[PDB]
Amino acid sequence: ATCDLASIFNVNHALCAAHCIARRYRGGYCNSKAVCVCRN
């Protein structure tokens, strides 16, 4: 749910989630491939 380390851009979950969360969604989580999976 938090992320997956990613690298020097682990924050790639909070920024993307902003759009989703705003629409009353959960937001987004980094999958195994260290990529934000924002639920929108």
From Swiss-Prot:
Changing residue 33 to R: In strain: Gbjo3a. Induction: By bacterial infection. Keywords: Antibiotic, Antimicrobial, Cleavage on pair of basic residues, Defensin, Disulfide bond, Immunity, Innate immunity, Secreted, Signal. One of its GO terms (cellular component) is extracellular space. GO terms for biological process: defense response to bacterium; defense response to Gram-positive bacterium; humoral immune response; innate immune response. Disulfide bonds join 3-30, 16-36, 20-38. Its main location: secreted. Changing residue 7 to R: In strain: Gbng3365b. It comes from the Eukaryota. Belongs to the invertebrate defensin family. Type 1 subfamily. Responsible for the anti Gram-positive activity of immune hemolymph. This is Defensin. It comes from Anopheles gambiae. The gene is Def1. The chain holds residues 63 to 102 of 102 of the full protein.
